[PDB]
Structures are given as structure tokens and as C-alpha cells.
Amino acid sequence: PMILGYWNVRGLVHPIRLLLEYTDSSYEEKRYAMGDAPDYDRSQWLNEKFKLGLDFPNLPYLIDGSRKITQSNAIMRYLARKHHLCGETEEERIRADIVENQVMDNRMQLIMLCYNPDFEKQKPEFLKTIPEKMKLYSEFLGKRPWFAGDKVTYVDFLAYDILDQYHIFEPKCLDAFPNLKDFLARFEGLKKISAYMKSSRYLSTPIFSKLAQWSNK
């Protein structure tokens, strides 16, 4: 089977775990453990980081026979191509490309805050910016069922993750945006997704590693 490697946290790998499930992919995971403070030992991963034949060793990685990939977006893309979940027109490609990158930005902004030792006093200032972030996603999606247009694409997997993440962070952040709540419901509604959510493999939290100030256990 295919081998997915990542930490034993949701981190940025949720869309991949979801995509593997949605596609009926035959895979096994290697969930690396991180030690507690103050050392935060990474040896389970460091012991093999340089022994897997990866070009640019990192987590996550996907081993698919002879093919070894790193970089989360590259992995999503690989699986999208294999299962025809890319945009089919130029307009769908452009929307998927923008979303792909936008999600990373919003992910980085959350990480910046969550790893700040000043988290508690920085928070109020971050909360302030949430409404604007959601509004842009809300207006982008508009009345479409999916982010690229009329059919699910890999970018829905990314968008779901980051919307879910913000909603965990600030549970009232989607109240003003019905289409976003609807989207989350629609996604969770997909048969293979609904099935996975009830499985032993499902890992919703923690989001971050033990070093974080929030969702770190």
C-alpha cells in the first residue's frame, strides 16, 4: 500500500488523510510521536528522516511504490491527478490555485499566533481579524456548492480543514456566514467522509504539536 508519514497530530495533514479516505486509497500511516517539554524529543522521526530516499526529507511524506513525495500541496496534487479531482476548465484551475495558496496563508497566521509565548494577550487582536477572513471565503464561494465550481475538487479538502480549524478556535465565527456553515455540513455529508469520521483512524485534535499554546494536547 501507500505510506503516509506525519506526526500524531492533525497539523496540516488533515486534507491528505481525508483525500486518501474519499478516494478509497489503499494506505497505511506512520504517526510519529513527539516527546513532552522541555526537550520535545523528535527521535522517532529523526532516526529515519534521512533513510527513506526522499529528495527533500520532510513531514508529511507519501510513498506510493517507487514515487516518494514531500510537500503537503504536492501530495494533494498527486492524489488529485490520480483520481481526477483537479479543475477541468481554466476558471476552475484558477479558483483552485488561489484557494490552495490562500489556505496556506490563513494556516500560517493561525500558527504564528498559536506558537507565540504571548498567545493570551495576542489573541484579542487576532479574533478581531477573523470576520474579515471568513467574509472573503464567504463571498468567494457564493452560491456554488464547491470552491472551484460545481464538482468537488482537492481544494475543498483544504478549505474544509482551515474553516473547521478556525471554527474550533472561535466557534461563533461562521454564524454570520450561512454558506460557510452549509459548506462544512455538505463536506462532512459525503459518504466516505462521514464513514471516516466514525473510524478508529480519525484524528480531529490536537491540531498543534506539544510546543504550541493552544490545541497542543
Ligand X SMILES: N[C@@H](CCC(=O)N[C@@H](CS[C@@H]1c2ccccc2-c2ccccc2[C@H]1O)C(=O)NCC(=O)O)C(=O)O
Binding site as annotated, residues for substrate: 115
Stretch that binds ligand X, among 82-90, 104-112, 151-159, 182-190 (CB under 6 A): 104-112
Nearest approach, Cβ of residue 35 and its own copies (Å): 23
Q: Candidates 24, 36, 39, 90: give the one binding its own copies (CB under 8 A).
A: 90
C-alpha cell at 41: 524529543
Q: Which is nearer to ligand X, 72 or 153 (CB)?
A: 72
- Which contiguous run of DSSP H or E holds residue 68? strand 67-70
Nearest approach, Cβ of residue 92 and ligand X (Å): 20
Scanning the structure block, which residue is given the C-alpha cell 488529485? 80
Which does residue 209 bind out of ligand X, its own copies, none, counting CB within 5 to 8 angstroms by kind? ligand X
Q: Candidates 41, 48, 88, 97: give the one binding its own copies (CB under 8 A).
A: 97
Q: Does 114 bind its own copies (CB under 8 A)?
A: no
Which does residue 11 bind out of its own copies, ligand X, none, counting CB within 5 to 8 angstroms by kind? ligand X
Walk across the sheet containing 67-70 and list its strands: 27-32, 2-7, 61-64, 67-70
Give φ, ψ of 52 to 5 degrees: -105, 0
Q: Which is nearer to its own copies, 68 or 167 (CB)?
A: 68
β-bridge partners, 4: 29, 62
Which does residue 107 bind out of ligand X, its own copies, none, counting CB within 5 to 8 angstroms by kind? ligand X
One-letter amino acid identity for 24? D
Q: Does 133 bind ligand X (CB under 6 A)?
A: no
One-letter amino acid identity for 153? T
One-letter amino acid identity for 211? L
C-alpha cell at 56: 527533500
Helix (H, G, I), strand (E, B) or coil at 161: helix
Q: Candidates 56, 129, 178, 194: give the one binding its own copies (CB under 8 A).
A: 56
Return d(Cα 79, Cα 128) in angstroms, integer: 36
3-state helix, strand, coil in the chain (%, to 5): 50, 10, 40
| Alpha-carbon distances of 173 from 55, 95, 119, rounded to whole Å | 40, 23, 19
Q: Which is nearer to ligand X, 7 or 169 (CB)?
A: 7
Residues near its own copies (CB under 8 A): 55-57, 67, 69-74, 77-78, 81, 90, 93-94, 97-98, 100-102, 105, 136, 139-140
Residues near ligand X (CB under 6 A): 7, 9, 11-12, 49, 58-60, 71-73, 101, 105, 107, 111, 208-209
